[PDB]
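Can you give me the bound-state structure? Components:
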Amino acid sequence: SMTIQEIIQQRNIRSLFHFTHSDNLTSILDNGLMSRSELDNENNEYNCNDEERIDGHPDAICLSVSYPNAKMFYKYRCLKPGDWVILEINPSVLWAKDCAFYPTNAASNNVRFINLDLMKGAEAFSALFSENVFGIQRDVNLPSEYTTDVQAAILVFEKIPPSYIISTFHPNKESAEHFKRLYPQTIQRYYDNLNARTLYSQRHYYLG
DNA sequence: AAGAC
Ligand SMILES: NC(=O)c1ccc[n+]([C@@H]2C[C@H](COP(=O)(O)OP(=O)(O)OC[C@H]3O[C@@H](n4cnc5c(N)ncnc54)[C@H](O)[C@@H]3O)[C@@H](O)[C@H]2O)c1
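Here's the bound-state model for the whole set.
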C-alpha cells in the first residue's frame, strides 16, 4: 500500500497551487495560509470568493495538485477585477499537514457526504488519479502528475506557514517586482505575455 | 474559459 510520499515520487508531482487575489498576498506571505474560520477568529482582513462554503469545511484551506482549479479560478477573475496570483506550495504539505483528498470539487454532491476520515490517507490521494472520476475519463496522454479532474481538491485542516510557499506567480512584471521588494528572500515569478500557456489558462489548453 | 447547492 503506497504512501502519499511514494505516490508523489512515482507521479513526479512537484507543485501544489492556491489561487488568491493580490489583495491577500501581503497577509499570506507574512502569516501563512489560514482557513476562513481561523481568519475570522483572528479578526484578519481577507477577500474570499466562496459565499456558501458548500464543502462544509470553513476550517480548511483549499489547494490543487499540479494545476489550479482553472474553472473556478477563471470565474472569480471575471467577478473580481485586479491582479490575481497563484501560490506554489511544497507537496510536503500533503503528508506533513492534516489533509483530505477529493477527486473532484470538495463542494460536489459526488464526494461531500462521505465520512471525512475516509478522505484522509493514501487511498483517497490515489483516487485523484483514477481512470474515471464521476464521468471524467482520464486521457491516456495526461501526464502522471495531473489529477483526472482539474477540480480535484486538497482540504488542509491546519494553517500553512509561509515557508511551505515555494514561489508566487504574478500576471505582470510590476506585480511581481512590488512583492519582491517587500519580500526579497522569496521567489516572485511573472509572465510577460498572458497570450500564452500559463497557470491562468484552462488546463486542456495548457497541456495542448 | 464562469464551481459548488
Ligand atoms: N483557492 C484555491 O486555489 C481553491 C482551489 C481548489 C478549490 N477551491 C474551493 C473553493 C471553496 C473555497 O473558496 P476560496 O475562493 O478558496 O475561498 P475561502 O473561503 O477559503 O476564502 C479564503 C480566502 O482567504 C485567503 N487567505 C488565506 N490565508 C489568508 C491570510 N493569511 N490573509 C489573507 N487572506 C488569506 C485565501 O487565499 C482565499 O482567497 C471551497 O469550496 C474549495 O472546495 C479553492
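A couple of observations. Residues A 18-20, 24, 27-28, 31, 33-34, 36, 39, 44, 46, 48-50, 53, 55, 62, 64, 68-69, 72, 105-107, 153 surround carba-nicotinamide-adenine-dinucleotide (CB under 6 Å). Residues 50, 52-55, 69-79, 104-109, 112, 151, 201-202, 204-205 of chain A lie near DNA strand B (CB under 10 Å from a C1').
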